Design a protein around this ligand. Sequence first.
Ligand SMILES: CCCCCCCC/C=C\CCCCCCCC(=O)O[C@@H](COC(=O)CCCCCCCCCCCCCCC)COP(=O)([O-])OCC[N+](C)(C)C
Ligand SMILES: CCCCCCCC/C=C\CCCCCCCC(=O)O[C@@H](COC(=O)CCCCCCCCCCCCCCC)COP(=O)([O-])OCC[N+](C)(C)C
Ligand SMILES: [Zn+2]
Ligand SMILES: [Zn+2]
Lengths: 678, 678
Amino acid sequence: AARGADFDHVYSGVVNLSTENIYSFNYTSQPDQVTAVRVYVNSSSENLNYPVLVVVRQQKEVLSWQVPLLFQGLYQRSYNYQEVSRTLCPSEATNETGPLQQLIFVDVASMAPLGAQYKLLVTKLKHFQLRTNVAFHFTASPSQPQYFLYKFPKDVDSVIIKVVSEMAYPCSVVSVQNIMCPVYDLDHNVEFNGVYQSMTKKAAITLQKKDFPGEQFFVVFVIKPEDYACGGSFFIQEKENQTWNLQRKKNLEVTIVPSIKESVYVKSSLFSVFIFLSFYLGCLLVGFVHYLRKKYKIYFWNIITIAVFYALPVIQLVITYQTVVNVTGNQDICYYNFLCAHPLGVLSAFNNILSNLGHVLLGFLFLLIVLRRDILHRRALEAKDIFAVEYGIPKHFGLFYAMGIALMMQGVLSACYHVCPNYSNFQFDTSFMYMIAGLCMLKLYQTRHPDINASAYSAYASFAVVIMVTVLGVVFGKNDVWFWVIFSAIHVLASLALSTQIYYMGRFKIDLGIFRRAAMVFYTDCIQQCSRPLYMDRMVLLVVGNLVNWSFALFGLIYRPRDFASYMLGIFICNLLLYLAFYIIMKLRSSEKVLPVPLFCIVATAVMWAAALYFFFQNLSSWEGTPAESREKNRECILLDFFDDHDIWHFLSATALFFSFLVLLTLDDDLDVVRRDQ
Amino acid sequence: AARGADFDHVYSGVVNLSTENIYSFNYTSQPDQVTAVRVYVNSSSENLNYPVLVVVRQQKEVLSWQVPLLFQGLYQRSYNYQEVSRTLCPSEATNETGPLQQLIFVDVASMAPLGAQYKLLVTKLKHFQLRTNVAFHFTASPSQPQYFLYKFPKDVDSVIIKVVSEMAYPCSVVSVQNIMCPVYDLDHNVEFNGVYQSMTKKAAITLQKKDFPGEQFFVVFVIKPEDYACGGSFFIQEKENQTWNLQRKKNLEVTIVPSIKESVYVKSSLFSVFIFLSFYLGCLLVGFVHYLRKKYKIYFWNIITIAVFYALPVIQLVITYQTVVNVTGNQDICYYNFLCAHPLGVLSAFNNILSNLGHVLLGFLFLLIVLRRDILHRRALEAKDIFAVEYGIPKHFGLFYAMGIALMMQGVLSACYHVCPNYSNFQFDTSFMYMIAGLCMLKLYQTRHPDINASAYSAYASFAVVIMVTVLGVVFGKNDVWFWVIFSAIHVLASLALSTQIYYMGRFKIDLGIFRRAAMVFYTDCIQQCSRPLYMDRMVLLVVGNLVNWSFALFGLIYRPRDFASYMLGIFICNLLLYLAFYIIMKLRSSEKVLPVPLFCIVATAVMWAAALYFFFQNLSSWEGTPAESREKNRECILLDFFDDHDIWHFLSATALFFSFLVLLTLDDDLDVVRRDQ
Ligand SMILES: CCCCCCCC/C=C\CCCCCCCC(=O)O[C@@H](COC(=O)CCCCCCCCCCCCCCC)COP(=O)([O-])OCC[N+](C)(C)C
Ligand SMILES: CCCCCCCC/C=C\CCCCCCCC(=O)O[C@@H](COC(=O)CCCCCCCCCCCCCCC)COP(=O)([O-])OCC[N+](C)(C)C
Ligand SMILES: [Zn+2]
Ligand SMILES: [Zn+2]
């Protein structure tokens, strides 16, 4: 007959084909209080052809499972768990009902000829409901999923569920579901409703109160039987003995914290706008107290078009990804910094888009500065001011305009990328900064070799080639050492050939015989100069540039960075700064000066590039690995509770590029001299 | 006690909190024979607070459910099904075991104070195993899922499961799983393992024998409680009365057919290569019996670069999509013609990539033809042949090279698209054919207005603008009639302005005053000509072109095609053919002839364009709707058991573009006259 049974009592028994064991559990749920029941069954018996069958009957629901619980892994590997445990979906007592009397039946059965042994334990969860800002520690398992209840407070309108574990394995899933039964807490149904994240050691889910009827939800923790989805293997979690006993226990700590208010949004947007409008204010003001004592059109049409063919396939995509899985609840599509990702409307990380405002604002400010210089210059030729026709270097502002437009387009492209960062998207974070870098290095060349220009397509088919190399080296050459040696050879030889041909010899000429000329340069210690040469300054700087590029390629060879786009960005930034330094050193070697404005811009360039590169090396997310592996890297916001390290990288890279543009524009202003230069 | 019960007998009973009803079912499974058992329970009782709980205990497994079965839809709509039915996962008897004796228990329980009424029926499935090429008809339901067994024959190495229904609703899921228990046949777990497709009225899953241990699988059919995933609404399947009785019965027919052999692959690849190598053979042979009686370099670098910035974001993607969900089994990501989609390696539809071979081969053949013409011409100026300097129209082959390169790039881009067609990808099927079309129309202009050329970026920022319009009109203007009227206004006014300025008036000049000049042209019947004018031929053709474009825009206005990329392609093809016809008619109006080669090329152009456009209107898949809605359109292969209508569109569009290139190249050959032309 029925066995009136007690909570928190361990019942041991034996069940064969003849005898089936019933247990009755009676309990009362009081209003304004939620009681969850947890059933544990373990079975020392190990005969997988006669498992123990457990049935839990409630008033409105039935649950059933086998002990041992069997899982099937990839490559036909099978696991069995002798301890199974489940929380029964609770019906919460309200004032409509009063004290609810609840009955629960537990059937244990088996078809074994001689019965199977089992232990049963039914408990009431003392801590089923999670509290705001209180950290809760618990343990889960592939055969013992967990879930807890959270009720939104009356003033909180949005929360973040932050889940932390100290070990990466076992791979896990954190799901948020509504409180209507049933709860989907099994491996095969957690990803059906609600919003979920795969997790190794970090998860962070942002929830709005308006998405949940009753202002409540369940947080479900389901441990996976293998680690393939998290970047591991069949069994890379070593906990226990491999003798008829298997557990993948995971220690978890969950904290549900309220999100930032709209005051933080307002304050951060105001800060982001005003720090870069202070640039406009300072520039105009200092220029107007200093005042107190077109062939370039096509250039615009050059970059914008290249931007369009570059910027449209990414927009099309993020619009899709920001939606086509937003409604799905799968938060493994976009690789956000989920610990600093503040939503606004349909944007899941509005701070990552807002931090790109500096690129646009400073690109426009530089366009205004170049426009004023172009206007004053073109005006000075109209009055035939002799200081404009036969004094100083001939000016061609057509490439500074491209610099400013490219800065703005970099802001736009990186914002579009940060709408949803993933693997089909990565280059749009920093690839246009190659173009910018190129446009600067070219401007370093044409500032003293002015009558050399091919700005139709060879100036941008180079960008196409660089993008091809970067993308196909990320996709097809992840760390394959046969790719890295080939690319290092290309890097070293390009660096030597082009540096000996363009920097040395001063010619923009791209033959096959550059190598021959690169033999003609220095294999001449017994032809041209001694170890105490005459025009050594160019040769030492050539050797130093080649040494820097060789060291860079060597570090890339040993360390083999999987993020090859950031590595290419490092190549370009390093070479830009190196040849800018070489130009300044050559200016100082001559009798030329460095006026106060370019001097301040040089110091600001160095400082901003150091700071920007510090914040660039803070890895807060990935796309190389799995979403859980990238979530391992997430960090809280570092500035104003709104911006993380990558946002500061955006700000400071915009500022550093702006000041490098200013150096390029204002370096040669000391040449108010009639043209007798080299 | 236990009730020894019979199969195919209907047991009616009442279960309250006190009485629980058990039924025992005993049966033998013979070796080399699979027996599946199906349990049906219905409950006339309708008190959703005291459902009937059904437990089915087998030796190695337990199953349980409620009657009525409750489903929760979107927007908090709830459904209840009073008839539930399930097939128990069978353990198949082999020669290791012999005749297996199997026992099955069915528990019916309820906590109702006065019991609930129920009917129980347990049957043996007569047709659990599906046979090759035999169609099997059955019925499924959201509360009565079905699944069947298929064993691969000893010689078949790959099959296609083709599922057909005559009505689109209810929305359904067809899943393929391995035969190891349990079977995931519920709404919340079908998409966990195996490969699945959502289906309204057509599904087609291709399976390799090597993916399945034991050469067996289960085909699972699960009906969804709503139609949202298939493009419907909460309840758009009207079958039954809405009085306490709910069924979403779906009639299904499944056929498992063997796939084509590798002989078909070989024969189809040989055909695809040889039909287009016959072009090379015929061209070279006829040219060599007829023989029996560089400024253009940059042009190359123009298109390739534009191709790169266009072709790389799509490759990056398909590589991802061809994999990132290939291993997931979700076949709702790529919108193939699943009834003609033949795999080769990692490509799921190798025929769609192979059919793009004609573009590459014919683009190369045209490049060779233009190269030979360029060589003979440049040679004729070196000998100062007077027929090359003062005879005929001045020649500039720099744009024919772009035509050939663009044809090759269209082949490449459409292949990359067909690696995985979906919504983030669509333009790459036909968008580059805009460029080609443009490059042809421009060549129609410069053939008589030669000293007008701006081929730096305005010739391709137009392509960028057209791509922007197309993509943002697909994404943000699906059928929104406020988008279609705006685009129709733009189309009509662009067609009138540019046709009156470029075709009429012969000027490539883009001011705001074109409209004024378009008032100056014809609002002059009382200024220039009577109704019997002098140079009417240009005016009638102008009016006819504007009428054709207006009719096109009007049809687009009423019918509002959701595939706007194909609509833009129609605009471009129509205008190309229209102005080519106008050029030929003007040639005939003058004393000029049409030599035999351009005459044959004109006839071939017309014929190939008619055939290609017929095969273009065969809609075999979509990306506008859901994957099930696009699968409604799938068709079997029409040619060689390998190619469908879209593959023939690829072939014939390559041929039609090739012959239009030939018309453009060879039309003006009758001008062996000294230059006294208009
Ligand atoms: C006189 C004038 C002086 C002026 C000099 C001015 C020159 C300017 C100098 C420096 C500017 C360079 C910026 C570096 C940016 C590289 C980024 C990168 O590669 O990412 C990879 C790291 O990289 C590696 O693992 C090793 C490769 C880096 C080589 C280091 C340069 C040293 C070479 C020369 C030194 C030898 C000296 C030569 C001997 C003569 C990946 O790492 P990550 O953590 O995944 O990347 C983070 C980004 N992401 C996080 C968001 C993923
Ligand atoms: C001989 C040379 C000189 C003449 C040259 C002219 C020849 C050149 C003519 C045509 C060249 C191109 C042919 C049409 C291509 C349209 C494509 C299209 O829009 O698809 C849409 C159909 O769209 C519609 O159903 C309505 C729009 C079509 C308008 C028809 C033009 C009539 C105008 C003139 C008549 C009145 C003129 C009055 C005279 C004063 C979408 O439908 P679909 O089925 O999804 O598309 C299938 C594609 N896909 C399936 C694979 C998805
Ligand atoms: Zn960024
Ligand atoms: Zn196609």
